[PDB]
Short mmCIF file of C-alpha atoms in Angstrom, two decimals:
data_model
loop_
_atom_site.label_atom_id
_atom_site.label_comp_id
_atom_site.label_asym_id
_atom_site.label_seq_id
_atom_site.Cartn_x
_atom_site.Cartn_y
_atom_site.Cartn_z
CA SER A 1 0.00 0.00 0.00
CA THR A 2 1.33 3.39 -1.12
CA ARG A 3 -0.20 6.84 -1.38
CA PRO A 4 0.56 10.24 -2.93
CA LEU A 5 2.59 12.98 -1.26
CA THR A 6 2.40 16.26 -3.19
CA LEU A 7 5.22 18.81 -2.95
CA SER A 8 5.15 21.99 -5.01
CA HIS A 9 6.97 25.32 -5.23
CA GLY A 10 4.72 27.64 -7.21
CA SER A 11 3.15 26.30 -10.39
CA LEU A 12 5.48 23.30 -10.62
CA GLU A 13 4.59 20.26 -8.52
CA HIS A 14 5.57 16.64 -7.95
CA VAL A 15 4.09 13.56 -6.26
CA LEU A 16 5.85 10.77 -4.34
CA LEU A 17 4.00 7.46 -3.94
CA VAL A 18 5.46 6.80 -0.50
CA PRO A 19 4.41 3.66 1.42
CA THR A 20 1.95 4.05 4.28
CA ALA A 21 4.52 2.68 6.74
CA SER A 22 6.67 5.84 6.45
CA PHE A 23 3.95 8.25 5.33
CA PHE A 24 4.10 10.11 8.64
CA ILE A 25 7.87 10.63 8.55
CA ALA A 26 7.64 11.63 4.88
CA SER A 27 4.85 14.11 5.66
CA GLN A 28 6.67 15.77 8.55
CA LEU A 29 9.80 16.02 6.38
CA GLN A 30 7.62 17.63 3.71
CA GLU A 31 6.23 20.13 6.22
CA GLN A 32 9.59 21.26 7.58
CA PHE A 33 11.03 21.22 4.04
CA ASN A 34 8.34 23.64 2.87
CA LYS A 35 9.02 25.74 5.97
CA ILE A 36 12.73 25.87 5.06
CA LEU A 37 12.05 26.55 1.38
CA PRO A 38 11.84 30.23 0.33
CA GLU A 39 8.55 31.54 -0.96
CA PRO A 40 7.84 31.20 -4.71
CA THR A 41 8.32 34.08 -7.12
CA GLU A 42 7.12 34.68 -10.66
CA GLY A 43 9.42 33.01 -13.16
CA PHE A 44 11.51 31.36 -10.42
CA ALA A 45 14.27 33.82 -11.28
CA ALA A 46 15.41 34.26 -7.67
CA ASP A 47 18.45 32.29 -6.56
CA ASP A 48 18.39 29.34 -4.16
CA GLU A 49 14.95 28.15 -5.31
CA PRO A 50 13.80 25.48 -7.77
CA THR A 51 12.69 26.35 -11.30
CA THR A 52 11.39 22.98 -12.56
CA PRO A 53 9.85 19.96 -10.81
CA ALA A 54 13.13 18.08 -11.31
CA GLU A 55 15.01 20.87 -9.53
CA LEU A 56 12.47 20.86 -6.70
CA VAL A 57 12.72 17.11 -6.13
CA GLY A 58 16.51 17.26 -6.26
CA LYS A 59 16.52 20.02 -3.67
CA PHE A 60 14.40 17.78 -1.45
CA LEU A 61 16.89 14.94 -1.97
CA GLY A 62 19.82 17.14 -1.03
CA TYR A 63 17.99 18.44 2.04
CA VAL A 64 17.08 14.95 3.27
CA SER A 65 20.63 13.76 2.56
CA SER A 66 21.99 16.61 4.68
CA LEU A 67 19.61 15.62 7.49
CA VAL A 68 20.73 11.96 7.18
CA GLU A 69 23.85 11.13 9.23
CA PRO A 70 25.28 7.67 8.46
CA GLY A 71 18.38 5.11 10.01
CA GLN A 72 15.90 7.82 10.96
CA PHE A 73 15.10 8.94 7.39
CA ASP A 74 17.07 6.35 5.41
CA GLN A 75 13.99 4.54 4.08
CA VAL A 76 12.28 7.71 2.87
CA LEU A 77 15.55 8.96 1.38
CA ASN A 78 15.95 5.70 -0.54
CA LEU A 79 12.32 5.72 -1.69
CA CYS A 80 12.26 9.28 -3.00
CA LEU A 81 15.76 8.89 -4.49
CA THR A 82 14.55 5.84 -6.41
CA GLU A 83 11.49 7.79 -7.55
CA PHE A 84 13.71 10.63 -8.77
CA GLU A 85 15.97 8.21 -10.66
CA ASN A 86 13.05 6.37 -12.26
CA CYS A 87 11.21 9.52 -13.33
CA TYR A 88 14.19 11.58 -14.53
CA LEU A 89 17.19 9.22 -14.90
CA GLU A 90 15.84 6.98 -17.66
CA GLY A 91 19.01 4.91 -17.61
CA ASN A 92 21.14 8.05 -18.09
CA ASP A 93 23.56 9.75 -15.74
CA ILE A 94 22.93 12.86 -13.65
CA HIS A 95 25.03 15.09 -15.90
CA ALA A 96 23.06 14.28 -19.06
CA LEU A 97 19.91 15.31 -17.18
CA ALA A 98 21.70 18.44 -15.97
CA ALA A 99 22.60 19.38 -19.55
CA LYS A 100 19.01 18.72 -20.60
CA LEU A 101 17.69 21.12 -17.95
CA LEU A 102 20.34 23.70 -18.87
CA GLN A 103 19.46 23.62 -22.57
CA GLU A 104 15.73 22.91 -22.82
CA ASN A 105 14.58 24.27 -19.45
CA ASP A 106 15.14 27.73 -17.94
CA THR A 107 17.79 26.57 -15.47
CA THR A 108 20.92 28.46 -14.45
CA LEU A 109 24.42 27.09 -13.92
CA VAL A 110 24.28 27.48 -10.13
CA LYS A 111 20.92 25.69 -9.96
CA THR A 112 22.21 22.88 -12.18
CA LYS A 113 25.34 22.46 -10.06
CA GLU A 114 23.27 22.45 -6.86
CA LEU A 115 20.94 19.82 -8.34
CA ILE A 116 23.95 17.67 -9.23
CA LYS A 117 25.33 18.13 -5.71
CA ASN A 118 22.04 17.15 -4.11
CA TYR A 119 21.70 14.01 -6.22
CA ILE A 120 25.28 12.84 -5.68
CA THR A 121 25.19 13.57 -1.94
CA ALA A 122 21.92 11.65 -1.59
CA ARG A 123 23.33 8.75 -3.60
CA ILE A 124 26.41 8.41 -1.41
CA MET A 125 24.61 9.06 1.89
CA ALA A 126 21.86 6.51 1.24
CA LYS A 127 24.32 3.58 1.14
CA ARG A 128 24.13 3.75 -2.67
CA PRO A 129 27.62 4.44 -4.06
CA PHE A 130 28.52 4.35 -7.76
CA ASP A 131 30.20 0.94 -7.46
CA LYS A 132 27.99 -0.33 -10.28
CA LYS A 133 29.84 -0.01 -13.57
CA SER A 134 28.45 2.74 -15.79
CA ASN A 135 27.18 2.05 -19.32
CA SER A 136 28.34 5.31 -20.89
CA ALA A 137 28.35 5.20 -24.69
CA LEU A 138 31.89 6.57 -24.95
CA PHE A 139 33.37 3.95 -22.64
CA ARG A 140 31.31 1.16 -24.22
CA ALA A 141 32.81 2.20 -27.56
CA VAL A 142 36.24 2.16 -25.92
CA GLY A 143 35.62 -1.33 -24.56
CA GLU A 144 34.64 -2.63 -28.00
CA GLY A 145 37.49 -0.66 -29.61
CA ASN A 146 35.32 1.77 -31.59
CA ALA A 147 36.90 4.84 -29.93
CA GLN A 148 40.31 5.80 -28.53
CA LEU A 149 40.76 8.07 -25.51
CA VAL A 150 43.66 10.41 -24.78
CA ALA A 151 43.59 12.47 -21.58
CA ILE A 152 45.07 15.98 -21.71
CA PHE A 153 45.75 17.94 -18.52
CA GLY A 154 46.04 21.71 -18.59
CA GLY A 155 48.43 24.06 -16.85
CA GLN A 156 49.08 27.76 -16.40
CA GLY A 157 47.53 30.57 -18.41
CA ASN A 158 44.19 28.88 -19.08
CA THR A 159 42.25 31.14 -16.70
CA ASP A 160 42.81 33.84 -14.09
CA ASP A 161 40.22 32.40 -11.66
CA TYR A 162 41.07 28.70 -11.38
CA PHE A 163 40.33 28.87 -7.66
CA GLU A 164 36.64 29.45 -8.34
CA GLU A 165 36.73 26.20 -10.31
CA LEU A 166 38.39 24.48 -7.36
CA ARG A 167 35.69 25.98 -5.14
CA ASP A 168 32.89 24.73 -7.38
CA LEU A 169 34.48 21.27 -7.40
CA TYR A 170 34.72 21.19 -3.59
CA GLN A 171 31.14 22.46 -3.31
CA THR A 172 29.28 20.50 -6.00
CA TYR A 173 31.25 17.25 -5.56
CA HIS A 174 32.05 17.65 -1.86
CA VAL A 175 31.19 14.05 -1.01
CA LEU A 176 33.24 12.72 -3.94
CA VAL A 177 36.46 14.79 -3.96
CA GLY A 178 36.35 15.75 -0.28
CA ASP A 179 38.82 13.03 0.67
CA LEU A 180 41.09 14.08 -2.20
CA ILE A 181 41.02 17.76 -1.27
CA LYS A 182 41.55 17.04 2.43
CA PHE A 183 44.48 14.75 1.59
CA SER A 184 46.00 17.39 -0.69
CA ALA A 185 45.59 20.09 1.97
CA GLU A 186 47.23 18.01 4.70
CA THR A 187 50.13 16.87 2.51
CA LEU A 188 50.69 20.43 1.29
CA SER A 189 50.76 21.65 4.90
CA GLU A 190 53.21 18.88 5.80
CA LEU A 191 55.43 19.79 2.84
CA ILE A 192 55.42 23.46 3.86
CA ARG A 193 56.26 22.51 7.45
CA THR A 194 59.11 20.20 6.43
CA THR A 195 60.54 22.53 3.78
CA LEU A 196 63.12 24.93 5.17
CA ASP A 197 61.92 28.19 3.59
CA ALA A 198 58.40 27.42 2.32
CA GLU A 199 56.75 29.54 5.03
CA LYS A 200 58.60 32.59 3.69
CA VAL A 201 57.19 32.05 0.19
CA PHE A 202 53.70 31.35 1.57
CA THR A 203 52.95 34.67 3.24
CA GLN A 204 49.20 34.00 3.63
CA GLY A 205 49.53 30.25 4.19
CA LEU A 206 48.11 27.36 2.19
#
């Protein structure tokens, strides 16, 4: 037995067919989620709000994932995450959907990045890593030999604001590259400490 749970932000709306066993926990999460959510505006042009039903559901996923601390809301997180995947990820990855919203729908870059963050954070938090091998067309072609891949890594002079790109990586993919960035920070600090004159070069620290 399952029943509808309607969540909307302005004209756009969505329905989760949650089971009756966790309907109460889902409903209270809905109530406090709507309380947290900012009020709708015409066109959804204001920042930090959804613009499409996909964006709204993904915001709810990210919010529930933040509230989850790896059992209280794990079942509802898994249920609504599966609903989101079934309705919007028709076998495709999150980034293809993100590009689709960016192109077809009136979605901004920050909203798309925040949707991606919410989905990935929910996926990792709900004991659902990406251990399953992906079926990307490019890598399938590589496996069958139809395409060849050469990685190229950039360097200096590409941009004057590379740190904003580091910041967007740490933000959007915090759960993924957080271990990498923490490891890099600690080893860089250790290298500065061990090096004789590194502190002099690093006036503002690292």
